[PDB]
Paper text:
A cocrystal structure of [name](S) in complex with H1/PR8 HA was determined at 2.69-Å resolution. [name](S) exhibited well-defined electron density and recognizes the hydrophobic cavity at the interface of the HA1–HA2 in the HA stem region. This region consists of residues His18, His38-Leu42, and Thr318 from HA1 and Asp19, Trp21, and Glu38-IIe56 from helix A of HA2. The amide carbonyl of [name](S) makes a direct hydrogen bond interaction with the sidechain hydroxyl of Thr318 from HA1, whereas Cγ2 CH from Thr318 makes a CH-π interaction with the A ring. Similarly, the C ring of [name](S) makes CH-π interactions with His18 and Trp21 from HA1 and HA2, respectively. Nonpolar interactions of [name](S) include contacts with the sidechains of Thr318 and Val40 from HA1 and Trp21, Thr41, IIe45, IIe48, and Val52 from HA2. This network of polar and nonpolar interactions of [name](S) with residues in the stem-binding site appears, then, to stabilize the HA1/HA2 interface in its prefusion conformation and prevent pH-induced conformational changes to the postfusion form. Overall, [name](S) buries ∼130 and 171 Å2 on HA1 and HA2, respectively, of H1/PR8 HA, which is a fairly small surface area compared to the known small molecule, peptide, and antibodies targeting this region. The key differences in the [name](S)-binding site on H1/PR8 vs. apo H3/HK68 HAs are the presence of a glycosylation site at HA1 Asn38 in group 2 HA, the orientation of HA2 Trp21, and the presence of Asn49 and Leu52 in helix A of group 2 H3/HK68 HA that could all lead to steric hindrance of [name](S) with group 2 HAs and render it group 1 HA specific.
The HA glycoprotein is the most abundant transmembrane protein on the surface of influenza and is necessary for initiating viral infection. HA is a trimeric class I viral fusion protein with a globular membrane-distal head containing the receptor binding site and a membrane-proximal stem housing the fusion machinery. These two regions of HA have two essential functions of facilitating entry into host cells through binding of HA to host sialosides and membrane fusion upon entry into endosomes, respectively. Endosomal uptake is necessary for infection where the low pH of the endosome triggers conformational rearrangements in the metastable prefusion HA that lead to a postfusion state and subsequent membrane fusion.
Numbering used by the authors:
A (entry chain A), C (entry chain A), E (entry chain A): 11 to 54, 54A, 55 to 83, 83A, 84 to 95, 95A, 96 to 125, 125A, ...
B (entry chain B), D (entry chain B), F (entry chain B): 1 to 171
Write the structure that this text describes.
């Protein structure tokens, strides 16, 4: 009579690597590296993202007419920009602190688009019909939906001084613009004042703008420029504009709400009726594995991104079924 | 292996033992058969489950981490952010791969140790009532029925019960 | 006769964790994680810290009257600010490069407060009695101790041009201010010049300041603003001020010395007659352990901060006393 | 254990052996008693002291590290500094916990190895002059006084001195 | 007859450290820490570096006369500055965004120095012979090789407006300067206009410069200042200068090419006829080891820098030849 | 050692065995001599070569990494860049030294394990035809010529061929 001591073997072809040996066939193992995604843009914990479509951050906040208008009140879990965002800043100019504005929006979870300065009520004795061809819509010349080009009325540009008190209970993002004609003749024809100025003041913001006239190369068939500025009016604070020309006045501001875990991503995938706890620009990840080699840009509760192509931990024995 | 049992003096594994990682194969007049050792198998399962769960837990939940944008006059800050991201990625890839390799080596050595410990336990139970015919097997110097095989498998082998017969057959 | 081989056991209840097993009772172990502190602010290597009390960095450097005046010459190992620092910038305005100034002070180990421009000697034909209610002291209106509000004297504000040569052998922090009235009437009443300017020049610093007049929301019952600027005059260099109005002139500058291992912390603990090699906002650490889970902000020679709740390394055996 | 001695064929520990980690318990006509093995105990103490000191030394002195402040128009730089701090903290917590776990496992295995090595040394010294009665014990086939026990404990056991008596009693 | 089982031993004195023991003599080992270098500056993958000699980045780009002129077209793998770069900004002033310019040059692999505005063709009715003693050469007063000091001609400084179209197919670094006299008398004597201005515009760049007059401390025996500005004209874009005084006009621009793996280092070693894949400020590294304790600043394919003094991995056994 | 062979019951090494890490020394009427065991030596060489190559490969190629410059009003950014560089350097020095120490310990234990496994294989081959005279040696109970020594060294020892003579000499 005999008795033997042995160990398990099966038809497992799983291979793991050790420090002393590579490609060790084992009976049981566990994959720690997640490489699978659905290739879709899904909701993040029940909240759909904010898709800007043809627009980017600048074009959406300024109100580019070429982009489909969004609902007045929106809420999202993350922002999505398309790689070929052709509609953004339509009139040539510089967006001051645009990256800081994107970083601020990265923690925003909701906006309410309201009329801070009504068009036919806020700027008397001034023309509010100024449009341009660089911001065309349906072939015709147009202008931003959230801004208003104030020009001379009846050969006179009286000094305007308006203000808004923030009674929304939240931060109010306010955007405006400063125009710079290429020559002084256009300056007189548009604002009737060669020594014009703009002043924007709050309780913590204070800036003065002076037009700078010079011939500039044609960008979008425009020799003049238009610098865009923004600020975050705190709850209860008052913002005051005072100008005698060159002021691209605000018309629609944004009532913002702060959140956590949000961010801005550039994705090419489409939105589907799905939900996930982890979103990448390539697709959603439904996994509890610790690692993933899909994309370094992650939104939500995701595995740690690594460059590895294989992360498998052996749980069984050395498979020797011979 | 590090303990010389798996792929050592026990050359291969048993596909016929599907109930556990370690066990026995017996042969007597009543017949032959496999039987997994549930104690060592369960202890190894507990240890390896704890190891895997520990490796998974030590990696915290990766929350939202996106890229940032910089204008044409902020190249230094852009390169600094890129250096931070690349260094963190290098460090984490290094840690993950190294930990996986180390734990794989240690798990193989752990299975080897368990097999060797089971063999040595059976050997110290049997003493000179059986001879080591190699390949991790013992040939009894006495008749060992299913009751005797079960007393061997659960650690209650009666040495004086078969000592006289084993001494007679050993001559 | 028999002899046995065995191992040690005791009444130790210490538990450690392994990769294969948790909560292993062992005979001997060593704690590597320091979780104990004294809850006091102590000296750091024999040098007491600099406690600003009711003031912050801005209020202390500008000379807010609401804070108890410090000794003329001081030396410290680290700076402490209270969480509820109500006394800082008392006249509404912007502190330009204030965070960079804090970062510069983070490596400063000593200061000597000296009179760079005497009050009754530096600014002839100008009034030096300007005070405000936003910087009140003992109920009465007052002003910064280190600055001087120059106004019109006898209906005329002559162009002042003063300078200081640094013969202190060290860096000299010099602070000044620029006032911005809300209207031009107050501008004429205070400085008699509508086109005023300020100029501050050194060998490496050069800046010009122009007043910007506009009605602004009331902050501390003040519609005007006061922007604060600073510079570090190098040893041997000369600083020159040239102004015809709106200049909040310097009166006391700081002779600074550079050191190592210092920093600025926000703490709620009190100063005690004690000494340590490691200081946290929660208390001092007297330990040689490699890790600590007390606070990530550390001053001096401290253990590495970790989020762990337990870091115990086994030195003995598996305790089996049965 | 990894070597099957601690919590293995030697079931429990000895509270009566206070002088060291490993040792012996003897019993003869002159009486019984414990005695720690100072050589293996001292070598283990040296090794584990070196291990602990190494783990402590590899962590350099954490010098002054405080937070920084940023104005409302420097949110990107603030988030970059926060990301740097959080990544370093994650990495260091991970390293500390992982190293502690690995070294604890290795220390337990080291004690197991020391116990097994001591037992095997005693066994190879005794040879067939004593029988393995399990539980890490040996029953002599001859009279072994305190001098013989001391010659066993320090590695100078005289096999031919008791070979004849052990063969007679072994029969 | 006897047979024994044993292990190898030799006369090896190699020592390694373990977790349980230090200074373990072993039979075989491998050194992973590279500590050897040749102490020379070599080519990097067949391309010689760009040595600025007596100049730094600023002095080389502006065209300091004290430095030997380089070839019109150059290509390099990395830039080398000497620690004692005495020739840089020779006329006292501020180099705006100089560090960002260095960071931009860090990815440049080639330059072509061409004449963007010829001296005797671009600025009619203006004097182009302005020199200074702060930028002396061979004892005589001189000026930058790449800039031109435009002054008044025949008692009149007509408004100049010039432009350059980039048809080089690559980025064009253009540098210019703005002069600030200490008094208005010199302003009238040099530019005949007290209210002068400069304007530099491209398709993405737009800046206006106004002279600021004030008495300043003597730096290099000069009371005036000269601020230096730069821009990167994109291929196909046009740069336009428009000034009526104080314009230090450009004369030579740089046609730049982008590359990878380059950088700027400060070294004291000399250039030798050698080639390497790894370059440090102390010397070149010819090694395949993973680590090195030579220098943290590396160019090319280098080992990872560590502070360690010894990194030796045992491959053999514990050497016991007794 | 962890397995008690190197610097254990085999006290020292053999300088006369230059052909490998592990082997044998035989002595019979035909003479004496060393002979390295090529199988275990080659397997150890493969394993340690893989270990060294793995440690070298896990460290990626360090590409260009130079310092940056900052003006007098960018002290926070300068300190942030310095903190990033110093933290990465600390982490990498820590990882390198720790990995070297761990792998050195594991390599010593691996050699110990290989030596012990070779000894146990020879012992299980010889059985009672030879006696363990300690120091990792076996004294045969029969005449073992060069052919018998070679059959011992390559794992084809014929036990019944010398069983009768070994039993006669063992008496
Ligand atoms: C990792 O290990 C596995 C298993 O050892 C390797 O897979 C095997 O690769 C060998 C080639 O080296 C295959 O062998 C060939 O098989 C055919 C079958 O008809 C036979 O005709 C040839 O003469 C030759 O023997 C083998 O089939 C294959 N087995 C499996 C299950 O895939 C694998 O290649 C290793 N990977 C690496 C990267 O080393
Ligand atoms: C880590 O291990 C220790 C020791 O094994 C655990 O402590 C023990 O916990 C058990 C409960 O699981 C306690 O048992 C109870 O004891 C009372 C005593 O009268 C008895 O009446 C109950 O029937 C039950 O057996 C045990 O006393 C306690 N011992 C000590 C020394 O604390 C500990 O809970 C473990 N921790 C974790 C997190 O697993
Ligand atoms: C690491 O280990 C090596 C080898 O054990 C150490 O080297 C040795 O150091 C000892 C001193 O502790 C030297 O001993 C002296 O040797 C002279 C030779 O004439 C003798 O006269 C003295 O009485 C004493 O024994 C020994 O020669 C030397 N051997 C070699 C090969 O260097 C080394 O010091 C150790 N390093 C550390 C940091 O511990
Ligand atoms: C180990 O196996 C043996 C069988 O060989 C068990 O022993 C017998 O137990 C059954 C049921 O309790 C009795 O009917 C027999 O009379 C027993 N035989 C002898 C010879 O005692 C034993 O109980 C098992 N041990 C454990 C812990 O399960
Ligand atoms: C190990 O223990 C033995 C005791 O059994 C020691 O031997 C004896 O040593 C004493 C004192 O040196 C003598 O008086 C006895 O005559 C010795 N007895 C025999 C039988 O020789 C031995 O010295 C110890 N070994 C070591 C290294 O300490
Ligand atoms: C192991 O060594 C033995 C020598 O002891 C080898 O056996 C002999 O092989 C030679 C050549 O093949 C023959 O001429 C002898 O007649 C053999 N002797 C016996 C007793 O059979 C054996 O081949 C070796 N094994 C391996 C795998 O190389
Ligand atoms: O490998 C595993 C495993 C997988 C994942 C984890 Cl987290 C832990 C473990 Cl232990 N197993 C789980 C239990 O079953 C074992 C088995 C052994 C022999 C025969 C059949 C099944 C195999
Ligand atoms: O655990 C330790 C220890 C603690 C800290 C360090 Cl840094 C190193 C070590 Cl080795 N010990 C120190 C020596 O005494 C040992 C002992 C063993 C058995 C009985 C009584 C005491 C126990
Ligand atoms: O240590 C090594 C070694 C070095 C570097 C690497 Cl990457 C791998 C290894 Cl294995 N050796 C290489 C083969 O030869 C071995 C030897 C053993 C005994 C006697 C003479 C030579 C010794
Ligand atoms: C492999 O094993 C699995 C599980 O027992 C079984 O379902 C499958 O049919 C097997 N395949 C082969 C080819 O053996
Ligand atoms: C996600 O994966 C789990 C298993 O990991 C599965 O049960 C579930 O259906 C998947 N989908 C969703 C939406 O959870
Ligand atoms: C535990 O052991 C210590 C040290 O020997 C002793 O002082 C203490 O009294 C013991 N306590 C108990 C409850 O055994
Ligand atoms: C600090 O701790 C040590 C022991 O770690 C102790 O001796 C000392 O009294 C404590 N206090 C001071 C001020 O050192
Ligand atoms: C050491 O060994 C090497 C290699 O065998 C040999 O060349 C050298 O002469 C030896 N030196 C001594 C002093 O033994
Ligand atoms: C560099 O080192 C290698 C060996 O590592 C050597 O063959 C070569 O000659 C050295 N020099 C060059 C220029 O490669």
């Amino acid at each position: 009579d005999t008795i033997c001591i042995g160990y398990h073997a099966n038809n497992s072809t799983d291979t793991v690597d050790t420090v002393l040996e590579k490609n060790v066939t084992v009976t049981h193992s566990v994959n720690l590296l997640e490489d699978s995604h659905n290739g879709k843009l899904c909701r993040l914990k029940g909240i759909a993202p904010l898709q800007l479509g043809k627009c980017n951050i600048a074009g959406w906040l300024l109100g580019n007419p070429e982009c489909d208008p969004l609902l007045p009140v929106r809420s999202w879990s993350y922002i999505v920009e398309t790689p070929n965002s052709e509609n953004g800043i339509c009139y040539p100019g510089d967006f001051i602190d645009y990256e800081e504005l994107r970083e601020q929006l990265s923690s925003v979870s909701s906006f309410e688009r309201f009329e801070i300065f009504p068009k036919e009520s806020s700027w008397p004795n001034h023309n509010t019909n100024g449009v341009t061809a660089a911001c065309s819509h349906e072939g015709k010349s147009s202008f931003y939906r959230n801004l208003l080009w104030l020009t001379e009325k009846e050969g006179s540009y009286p000094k305007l001084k308006n203000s808004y008190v923030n009674k929304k209970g939240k931060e109010v993002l306010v955007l405006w613009g400063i125009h710079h004609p290429p020559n002084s003749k256009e300056q007189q024809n548009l604002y009737q004042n060669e020594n014009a100025y703009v002043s924007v003041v709050t309780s913590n913001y204070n800036r003065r703008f002076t037009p700078e006239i010079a011939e500039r190369p044609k960008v979008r068939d425009q020799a003049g420029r238009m610098n865009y500025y923004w600020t975050l009016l705190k709850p209860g604070d008052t913002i005051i504009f005072e100008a005698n020309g060159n002021l691209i006045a605000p018309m629609y501001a944004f009532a913002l709400s702060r959140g956590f875990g949000s961010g801005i991503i550039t994705s090419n995938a489409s939105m589907h009726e799905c939900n996930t706890k982890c979103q990448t620009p390539l697709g959603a990840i439904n996994s509890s594995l610790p690692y993933q080699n899909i994309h370094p840009v992650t939104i939500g509760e995701c595995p740690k991104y690594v460059r590895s192509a294989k992360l498998r931990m052996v749980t069984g024995l050395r498979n020797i079924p011979s | 292996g590090l303990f010389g049992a798996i792929a050592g003096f026990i050359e291969g594994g048993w596909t016929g033992m599907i109930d556990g990682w370690y066990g026995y194969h017996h042969q007597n007049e009543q017949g032959s058969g496999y039987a997994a050792d549930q104690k060592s198998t369960q202890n190894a399962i507990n240890g390896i489950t704890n190891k895997v769960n520990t490796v998974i837990e030590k990696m915290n939940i990766q929350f939202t981490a996106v890229g940032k944008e910089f204008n044409k006059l902020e190249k230094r800050m852009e390169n600094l952010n890129k250096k931070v991201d690349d260094g963190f990625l290098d460090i984490w890839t290094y840690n993950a791969e190294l930990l996986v390799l180390l734990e794989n080596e240690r798990t193989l050595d752990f299975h080897d140790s368990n097999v060797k410990n089971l063999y040595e336990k059976v050997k110290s139970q049997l003493k000179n009532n059986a001879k080591e015919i190699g390949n991790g097997c013992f040939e009894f110097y006495h008749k060992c029925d299913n009751e005797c095989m079960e007393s061997v498998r659960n650690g209650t082998y009666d040495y004086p019960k078969y000592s006289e017969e084993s001494k007679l057959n050993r001559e």
